[PDB]
């Protein structure tokens, strides 16, 4: 083939913006989408449900698959923007329950300061660091090569063969070097207040703030001090390359009118629909867009709004305890 050829790749930063686009898209007024979570499907399918494996009916996106859904919907909850949050993969420094506790690739964000085996500063904060460099020893990445720098040119991912003693101790970029001792040049990036970490962060993911909550104070997030050639560089959601978002809601918040049915027989399939219209008595009424807080699905028009996601799952009967949690973590 002889022709002009161009080699192009979308940057990862495109994703985080797209993520930032789904957030802010939640609001009351028009042009702001409103998402609902739906459960429903009270009646059991087959008899092999409640057994092991066996799979559910695989859900389809056709019109027939939507119609029945609206007939079985037991209840719904409206997602408010507050209960949605950004998230990133968390690597706790020097934790033995996750791979490579003492070793780190060229750039990997790693939280420290939480749990005793990493100490660094006190006054909590759950400090986080990007790690800009590594000791040079040990064979790494493509083919053989030998040395770090040559392995850093020609692409490559260099894994240090020397355990990194002690966590990153400082508040500012490139905390390594400056002493005969080893370690490598971690770079502070923000902080996580203790109050949010007990709620908003699970052990799989650590929250990173929306470029909003960083306003109405930065300090709570330990971002109060920064180089910032720009007046702000305010949103750091780009700095981490945060690729994903996470939802959380308590099942006490979802609204079941019947209130004895979801408990006795589980909701077998969950789907999330967008922009439902309110109940219209007859096609004599103008189209209104759904607001307030609960919506017994009787008050939702059938096929009223489009549905981005369907799940089919075995019965997942729910206890009425005031804590059980939805997750539904989006990867945008």
């Amino acid at each position: 083939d002889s022709s002009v050829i161009y080699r192009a790749i979308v940057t990862s930063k495109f994703r985080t913006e797209k993520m930032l686009n789904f957030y802010n898209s939640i609001g009351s007024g028009p042009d702001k989408n409103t998402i609902f979570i739906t459960f429903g499907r009270s009646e059991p399918w087959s008899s092999n449900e409640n057994e092991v494996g066996f799979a559910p009916p695989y859900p389809t996106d056709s019109v027939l698959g939507v119609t029945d859904m609206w007939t079985h919907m037991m209840g719904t909850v409206k997602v408010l923007p507050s209960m949605l949050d950004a998230v990133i993969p968390r690597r706790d420094w020097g934790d033995t329950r996750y791979p490579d506790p003492y070793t780190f690739r060229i750039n990997d964000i790693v939280v420290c300061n939480s749990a005793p085996y990493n100490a660094t500063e006190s006054g909590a904060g759950w400090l986080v660091y990007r790690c800009l460099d590594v000791p040079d020893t040990g064979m790494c990445s493509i083919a053989s090569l030998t040395d770090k720098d040559e392995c850093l040119k020609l692409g490559g991912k260099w894994t240090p063969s020397a355990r990194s003693m002690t966590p990153p101790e400082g508040r500012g970029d490139a905390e390594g070097t400056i002493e005969p001792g080893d370690g490598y040049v971690w770079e502070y990036l923000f902080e996580i207040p203790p109050d949010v970490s007990i709620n908003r962060c699970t052990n799989e993911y650590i929250v990173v703030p929306w470029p909003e909550e960083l306003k109405e104070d930065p300090t709570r997030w330990g971002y109060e001090d920064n180089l910032t050639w720009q007046q702000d560089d305010f949103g750091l959601i780009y700095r981490v390359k945060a690729n994903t978002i996470r939802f959380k809601a308590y099942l006490d918040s979802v609204y079941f009118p019947e209130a004895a049915l979801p408990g006795n027989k589980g909701f077998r399939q969950i789907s999330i629909i967008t922009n439902p219209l309110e109940a219209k008595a007859h096609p004599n009424d103008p189209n209104v867009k759904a607001e307030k807080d609960y919506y017994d699905p009787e008050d939702l028009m059938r096929h009223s709004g489009e549905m981005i996601y369907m799940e089919n799952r075995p019965p997942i009967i729910m206890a009425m305890d005031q804590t059980e949690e939805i997750n539904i973590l989006f990867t945008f």
């Binding site: 695989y58 389809t60 996106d61 056709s62």
Partner: protein, 98 residues
């Protein structure tokens, strides 16, 4: 892929269809796939290259008073030649054997 061709045996709405023919000491290599209305076909899967036996076998139950001619066994069952006597078709008969 230089061989096997393939032979479609049809489709089924439940797992485990029962197959016939397959002359002895030949065939082997079944393969299956799944499909639906809205989905693209999945990838084929092969089973352990089996092989058919020499003749056939049966163990049948009936009254202890009744007995079976060895031809009716050999023709219809152990050699699997149908149409010998098809109870769905032929008229049969009965005689009193003095």
């Amino acid at each position: 892929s230089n061989q096997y061709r393939w032979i479609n045996l049809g489709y089924t709405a439940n797992n485990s269809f029962f197959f016939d023919d397959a002359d002895p000491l030949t065939t082997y290599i079944i393969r299956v796939a799944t499909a639906a209305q809205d989905f693209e076909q999945s990838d084929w899967i092969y089973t352990e290259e089996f092989e058919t036996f020499a003749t056939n076998a049966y163990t049948f139950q009936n009254m202890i008073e009744m007995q079976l001619a060895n031809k009716f066994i050999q023709e219809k069952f152990t050699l699997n030649n149908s149409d010998y006597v098809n109870f769905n078709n032929d008229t049969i008969m009965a005689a009193l054997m003095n």
